[PDB]
Amino acid sequence: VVLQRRDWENPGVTQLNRLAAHPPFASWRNSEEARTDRPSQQLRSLNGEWRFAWFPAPEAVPESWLECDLPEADTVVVPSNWQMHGYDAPIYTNVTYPITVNPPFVPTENPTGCYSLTFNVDESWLQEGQTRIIFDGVNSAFHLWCNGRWVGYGQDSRLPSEFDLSAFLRAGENRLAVMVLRWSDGSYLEDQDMWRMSGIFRDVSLLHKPTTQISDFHVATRFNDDFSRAVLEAEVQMCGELRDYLRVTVSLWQGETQVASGTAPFGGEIIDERGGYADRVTLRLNVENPKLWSAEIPNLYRAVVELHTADGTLIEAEACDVGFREVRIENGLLLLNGKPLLIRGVNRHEHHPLHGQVMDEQTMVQDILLMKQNNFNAVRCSHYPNHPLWYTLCDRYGLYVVDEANIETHGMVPMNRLTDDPRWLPAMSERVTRMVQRDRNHPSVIIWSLGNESGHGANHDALYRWIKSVDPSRPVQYEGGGADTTATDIICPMYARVDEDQPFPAVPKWSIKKWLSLPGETRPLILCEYAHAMGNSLGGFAKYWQAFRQYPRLQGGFVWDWVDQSLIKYDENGNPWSAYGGDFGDTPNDRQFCMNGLV
Amino acid sequence: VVLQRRDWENPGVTQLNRLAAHPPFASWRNSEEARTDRPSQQLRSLNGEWRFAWFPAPEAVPESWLECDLPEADTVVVPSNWQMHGYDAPIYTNVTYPITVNPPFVPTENPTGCYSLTFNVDESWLQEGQTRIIFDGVNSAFHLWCNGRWVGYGQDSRLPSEFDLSAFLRAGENRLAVMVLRWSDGSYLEDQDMWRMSGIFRDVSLLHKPTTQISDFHVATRFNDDFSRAVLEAEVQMCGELRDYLRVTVSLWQGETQVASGTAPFGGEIIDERGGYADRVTLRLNVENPKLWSAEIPNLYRAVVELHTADGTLIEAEACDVGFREVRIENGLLLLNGKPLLIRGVNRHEHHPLHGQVMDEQTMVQDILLMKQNNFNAVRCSHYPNHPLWYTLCDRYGLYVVDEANIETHGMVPMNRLTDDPRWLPAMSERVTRMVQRDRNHPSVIIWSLGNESGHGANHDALYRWIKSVDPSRPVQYEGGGADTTATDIICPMYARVDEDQPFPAVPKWSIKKWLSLPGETRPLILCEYAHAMGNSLGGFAKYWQAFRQYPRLQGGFVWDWVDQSLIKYDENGNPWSAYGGDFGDTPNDRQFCMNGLVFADRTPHPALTEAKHQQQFFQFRLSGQTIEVTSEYLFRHSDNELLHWMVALDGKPLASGEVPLDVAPQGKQLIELPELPQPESAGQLWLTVRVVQPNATAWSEAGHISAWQQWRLAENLSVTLPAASHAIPHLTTSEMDFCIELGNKRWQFNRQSGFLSQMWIGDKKQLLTPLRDQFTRAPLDNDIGVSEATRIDPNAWVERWKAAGHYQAEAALLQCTADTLADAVLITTAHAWQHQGKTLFISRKTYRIDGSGQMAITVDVEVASDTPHPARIGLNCQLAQVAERVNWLGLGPQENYPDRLTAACFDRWDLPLSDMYTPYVFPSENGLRCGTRELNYGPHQWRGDFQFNISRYSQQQLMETSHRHLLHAEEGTWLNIDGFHMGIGGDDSWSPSVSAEFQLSAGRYHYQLVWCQK
Ligand SMILES: O[C@@H]1[C@H](O)[C@@H](O)OC[C@@H]1O
Ligand SMILES: O[C@@H]1[C@H](O)[C@@H](O)OC[C@@H]1O
Ligand SMILES: [Mg+2]
Ligand SMILES: [Mg+2]
């Protein structure tokens, strides 16, 4: 049935049985634990030792592997990329796709990773409530089994996939089986210039929720003219059986002091002729003289959301960090808290020389301290959503973030072949909508980006307008198709020069001073990539900074880029050395073009 | 594998293996055949006899059915709806979904239609090229097999689905097997107010293409400032192996003359850093002084697209009709070819009373001719893409079209539950993008619509912007979420009133004049639905047309709607009758709410159609003394097939006439001086009547078609002649029970206990079957009932207010009844009070004066309590003993007319048979009123006054208690209702009170008089 359908070769199927996207949940059962961000007993990690077997194609996987472990399987650490353990070669390629271009088909020789885990679930987890599994990231596509029964299917490597496991678990020993494919139709939208690797490369978790639960919540802030009064507006949705005694409380804390609070029953205001949302509620909280969030002073509040009965009993609690800040474009300038920003930015890939594309807290913290120590205030997630912990750290230390959808089709001819085709609009919309649903509560995220190097297509206009309408609190940018199309709020060129024009057919790169003054143009200009730092480089950097400071609508840009993407290899004596494209037998490749870092 | 996946319960799977959407193709292999639109040998129909079996669910279909035919299958005609053959019931429901609301799941009891066909494919079709099957429409979802192997899966009932069959066919006998499901997750987006039916309801075709083929093409037109030069721009894409010798030619023909031509190889201009489309080409053709397309003059060119080799050999040809027209919104107005449109529009469902939702050419052509004959210029596809032939006919005859995506989620709570959810954006985008890809080359399509009644969601904004960016040549409209959101170029309310605001929470309906001027508002306003035509309706229609003509940014609207959605059933004798919701055992249902048409389901007109024709006329007339001023409302054509007939008549008798040829420029005026009119001696009102007549036949009309008319009062002479004094005196006799008056052979008898005229005799022949009594009520109209959902009752509805107050139950009490002999007459004087539970509702004081000439003069004075709801009428009724063949009257006609729907009727002398004085509305109500009447003749009786009347074989009581017209039976004699006054009929909508205050009977005191005599 599974190898009969071939869901990985069909751009119309991007998932089967996958749950709705939402902000990170821990499902505390105690308001104090939620407030102070202590670990939740209801959120269990499955990171550790799994069993793994490599196969050259999905038709080579034996049927028995769904029932029980293979003899010829190894023990591996999860999260990991399987190419960092020597099962096949990592591939470094820039523009050219690492497979024959024949969308939506992939090769029949599609390397396959089979992972499996035996784990114990407590009795109390099965008696009541809902148990879900969460894959924070799997590259590129995967099918999931539990206890031999098929659960679901996922695509997009860079965002979480959640499945309901309640009807599949049993008390005692359970077994998961994950089959992961290197190539899928999703691969055509992921042609970023980076190592092409695969596996379960971000965390795996079990979460237990009650049957009546918070299913989503968003936080918005609104200010008066001089930022001395704010209204915090929280929207909460519940799932499960609606009852008259259910209440929601939202409280806002600064350290140990409660600052604001609101309670209400379910049932919103009338939306249209048929009524309102019975399963939703909106709280408005007033805050006098709020401390504002910026990269210079990252003041944060804590918001706790409680679902309780009218007689006080707590069902479930969720929480997030809240920063009060307003971003808007007014009269051609990007303003934060009423003042014009100057972006000291850098592009940053998730890369480690030993672990490949697996991030940890320690490496993330090291990068943020070095960035701030070198006078950076902003980071661009080139070119996909990051690990969820990254945003929390940027909220706490103070960096502005540009969050980017996982879409790049650089190697198509022409570049907009898929982004102008309506048959791909379903696959592109999942990449953009799920990103906004996960990250919209982080104060550090200040701009959304529709992806990178995909030409300009009608699908980009559609998705630009989707974001402006669900989230008006942040500008949208997109560089493709000449950096100033109707799908961008900011003119955002890549590698335009200060004084010299580069007059390419259809997609010219004007000098940045000339671009500002073209007939009709009123937007601000922020370079999404400039000053390419490959080897011994950054000549002429002072010339950009002279222009940023002289011209009000030149508001800075993001350097390309933070860290060299080299990998480690060993010689005969066991001494380590830095390796780039081609050094793994990967062919064709782009040699040393993967090292462009400041560090 | 198929029943394991359950693709019909997953909004993320809308198709499997379905080909890309494109304009209609025929794949001619000869440029002459393509140019002249002859049938293609490469396009084969499979319409005809298929085999069919019905099952209660998809798990009941036997495995063998993929291999070979079932024994217990029938032979049926395709296309068809299976409910029209009695396999299950059709369901009529308005808002409530016909299944439990639990998206995306459907019930396990999901009726399933299994169709199959054995057909022969020629050898030449398999040797080379590509064979595809095309389903023009299947409701709601289906899986397809060929020769036992699974091919593909489709959803969206209203657009074509195409599958490649090349690797599945074999020479000789082939078998298709189609399994169709009534319910799917697609059903949640198709909650239109209509019959819910299923099956393969549009055509099925095989198309053969070469391996190197045209895969798509679009046509755009661009003009200079005065529309004297045009550029036609054609974009062609090919599929298959690219070669250096391939060429494309585009040529443009007007009749038999070639007008423009262009040739090029493949390879477009650079698009971006990676290059251009190697498989695409763009031709630009210049056309000097092109003939422009409009609904007034539908000039069409023919465009032929040829894929050929550099040495001349033709691979394949495609073609389409091209009309040159520019639509844009500029400075708050909708312009066509630089001139502001005024939309005379109607909403139209695809409905046939025998065939259900299956359309044919003949029915389509009949609808277009009637629309144009009644002064409509525009049609809205409510609420889904139509049959592909519909657009071709609208291109050729000239109607503007609004094309609508198949999305409606009316029964969700709230209405935007799915349209605001990102998980449904994939399913909604397929409905909008495939529609634009199929229909964008039709010149008649002038506006895209995003669907109907689905609230406002982020998915609507996204799809609005998708269309503006792929097709900037047409505006987008959408009514949901308050009719003025960011997802619409035109403010497009539904049922907003001219003068009165309706201030609902979140989604208010301002009056249309106020809406235009709200702070910030700059768009044009076109009502996407107005004047709901349910039963006896369209009161207040003139009020909209007055406002459309006065205010530049009010550019018209679409009437709801064209045709009644009734079905046919049979009785025991095999006689057909019209059926509405509930009549098939379907439950729950919405009863008669499915009949809202201007015409009956068999395309006979209701009386409201004539009111629409007059209000929408293209000539306007003013009279100043002896001069008529004729103004043209045409934008593009000179009046070259028009002459003006005038006539002057005195109380029905003609005095003078004439004809003047019209010569009036678009938007111009012509003065017409009338000859010195005759001065008559006799008393009476002079009337002038003008009519515009088309002397020559058109594509859409016969010779002598009347397209416009107007009437005015001229001079009046009041009658100062006192009646001739007769010698005879009538004789009064007084018993205990009765007053009796004799004069000649005539006799009148008044009952002293009831105080009513109880009998008249001519000779010994009794004239009445019921006494002559006051009447204050009518059999309620659909606007009086005021219900849209059969589960929900409004206490503000007229009928509920009348019933609570006791108008249908009020009993007359006699106050006074006396008789006097005057010198030359007898005078009878009566008074009555109508009561309900102590409360006096009405008082009536009458005098009857019987003179020597035999004329009875009746004078009536009525008082109405100020706190009872205003009565429906103030008049008399009786049942006459005789039945005559004809009715002759002097007053407004000849059609039924009411105080708020009488602008189209003209004052004259009318004569009709009795059966034309009754309007056979499928749900029986008050009907047949004629207003402004001075004289009525029926058999030997004559009534004179200034009154309204209806005359028929059915009492008001029988019309009130009977739910279907076929159950009415003629009573003995004839029922006559004569009214001094009558309430308006309403019809701004049918689910709230909608009679304007100037047509309510709120004066508190009323007076009228009649003379009854024997002619
Ligand atoms: O490929 C990298 C980046 O993604 C691109 O946009 O510019 C060049 C750089 O090396
Ligand atoms: O249901 C019909 C139409 O679709 C709706 O929009 O208005 C009322 C009418 O009867
Ligand atoms: Mg790139
Ligand atoms: Mg509706």
PDB file of N, CA and C in Angstrom, chain B residues 656-678:
ATOM      1  N   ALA B 656     -56.357  59.145 -32.599  1.00  0.00           N
ATOM      2  CA  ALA B 656     -55.234  59.523 -33.463  1.00  0.00           C
ATOM      3  C   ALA B 656     -54.073  58.538 -33.252  1.00  0.00           C
ATOM      4  N   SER B 657     -53.229  58.384 -34.274  1.00  0.00           N
ATOM      5  CA  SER B 657     -52.058  57.500 -34.231  1.00  0.00           C
ATOM      6  C   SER B 657     -50.977  57.992 -35.207  1.00  0.00           C
ATOM      7  N   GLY B 658     -49.867  57.262 -35.297  1.00  0.00           N
ATOM      8  CA  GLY B 658     -48.741  57.677 -36.123  1.00  0.00           C
ATOM      9  C   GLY B 658     -47.488  56.886 -35.814  1.00  0.00           C
ATOM     10  N   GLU B 659     -46.519  56.980 -36.713  1.00  0.00           N
ATOM     11  CA  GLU B 659     -45.206  56.359 -36.552  1.00  0.00           C
ATOM     12  C   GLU B 659     -44.136  57.333 -37.044  1.00  0.00           C
ATOM     13  N   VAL B 660     -43.099  57.463 -36.232  1.00  0.00           N
ATOM     14  CA  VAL B 660     -41.952  58.305 -36.512  1.00  0.00           C
ATOM     15  C   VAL B 660     -40.702  57.418 -36.410  1.00  0.00           C
ATOM     16  N   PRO B 661     -39.822  57.417 -37.439  1.00  0.00           N
ATOM     17  CA  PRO B 661     -38.564  56.627 -37.338  1.00  0.00           C
ATOM     18  C   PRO B 661     -37.589  57.255 -36.326  1.00  0.00           C
ATOM     19  N   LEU B 662     -36.967  56.432 -35.469  1.00  0.00           N
ATOM     20  CA  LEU B 662     -36.019  56.963 -34.470  1.00  0.00           C
ATOM     21  C   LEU B 662     -34.615  57.077 -35.076  1.00  0.00           C
ATOM     22  N   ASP B 663     -33.972  58.203 -34.798  1.00  0.00           N
ATOM     23  CA  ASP B 663     -32.603  58.469 -35.227  1.00  0.00           C
ATOM     24  C   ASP B 663     -31.900  59.166 -34.069  1.00  0.00           C
ATOM     25  N   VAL B 664     -31.312  58.375 -33.181  1.00  0.00           N
ATOM     26  CA  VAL B 664     -30.752  58.915 -31.935  1.00  0.00           C
ATOM     27  C   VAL B 664     -29.387  58.253 -31.680  1.00  0.00           C
ATOM     28  N   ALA B 665     -28.377  59.094 -31.490  1.00  0.00           N
ATOM     29  CA  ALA B 665     -26.997  58.661 -31.258  1.00  0.00           C
ATOM     30  C   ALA B 665     -26.872  58.002 -29.870  1.00  0.00           C
ATOM     31  N   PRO B 666     -25.822  57.172 -29.660  1.00  0.00           N
ATOM     32  CA  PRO B 666     -25.600  56.594 -28.319  1.00  0.00           C
ATOM     33  C   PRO B 666     -25.475  57.706 -27.262  1.00  0.00           C
ATOM     34  N   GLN B 667     -26.345  57.627 -26.250  1.00  0.00           N
ATOM     35  CA  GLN B 667     -26.504  58.624 -25.152  1.00  0.00           C
ATOM     36  C   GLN B 667     -27.156  59.938 -25.635  1.00  0.00           C
ATOM     37  N   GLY B 668     -27.641  59.994 -26.878  1.00  0.00           N
ATOM     38  CA  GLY B 668     -28.201  61.233 -27.440  1.00  0.00           C
ATOM     39  C   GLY B 668     -29.680  61.423 -27.130  1.00  0.00           C
ATOM     40  N   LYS B 669     -30.258  62.512 -27.665  1.00  0.00           N
ATOM     41  CA  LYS B 669     -31.704  62.861 -27.558  1.00  0.00           C
ATOM     42  C   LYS B 669     -32.273  63.185 -28.942  1.00  0.00           C
ATOM     43  N   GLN B 670     -33.560  62.920 -29.106  1.00  0.00           N
ATOM     44  CA  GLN B 670     -34.313  63.308 -30.286  1.00  0.00           C
ATOM     45  C   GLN B 670     -35.626  63.952 -29.817  1.00  0.00           C
ATOM     46  N   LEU B 671     -35.987  65.116 -30.367  1.00  0.00           N
ATOM     47  CA  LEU B 671     -37.329  65.716 -30.097  1.00  0.00           C
ATOM     48  C   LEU B 671     -38.306  65.270 -31.190  1.00  0.00           C
ATOM     49  N   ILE B 672     -39.489  64.865 -30.764  1.00  0.00           N
ATOM     50  CA  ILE B 672     -40.541  64.445 -31.676  1.00  0.00           C
ATOM     51  C   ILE B 672     -41.761  65.328 -31.395  1.00  0.00           C
ATOM     52  N   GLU B 673     -42.121  66.162 -32.368  1.00  0.00           N
ATOM     53  CA  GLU B 673     -43.307  67.018 -32.246  1.00  0.00           C
ATOM     54  C   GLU B 673     -44.527  66.237 -32.752  1.00  0.00           C
ATOM     55  N   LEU B 674     -45.559  66.158 -31.915  1.00  0.00           N
ATOM     56  CA  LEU B 674     -46.809  65.503 -32.297  1.00  0.00           C
ATOM     57  C   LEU B 674     -47.675  66.499 -33.079  1.00  0.00           C
ATOM     58  N   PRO B 675     -48.451  66.010 -34.078  1.00  0.00           N
ATOM     59  CA  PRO B 675     -49.407  66.855 -34.820  1.00  0.00           C
ATOM     60  C   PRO B 675     -50.467  67.405 -33.857  1.00  0.00           C
ATOM     61  N   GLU B 676     -51.121  68.504 -34.234  1.00  0.00           N
ATOM     62  CA  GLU B 676     -52.220  69.072 -33.444  1.00  0.00           C
ATOM     63  C   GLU B 676     -53.214  67.949 -33.110  1.00  0.00           C
ATOM     64  N   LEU B 677     -53.382  67.693 -31.812  1.00  0.00           N
ATOM     65  CA  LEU B 677     -54.216  66.586 -31.322  1.00  0.00           C
ATOM     66  C   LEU B 677     -55.689  66.993 -31.434  1.00  0.00           C
ATOM     67  N   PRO B 678     -56.607  66.006 -31.546  1.00  0.00           N
ATOM     68  CA  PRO B 678     -58.016  66.392 -31.657  1.00  0.00           C
ATOM     69  C   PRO B 678     -58.612  66.797 -30.298  1.00  0.00           C
TER      70      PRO B 678
END
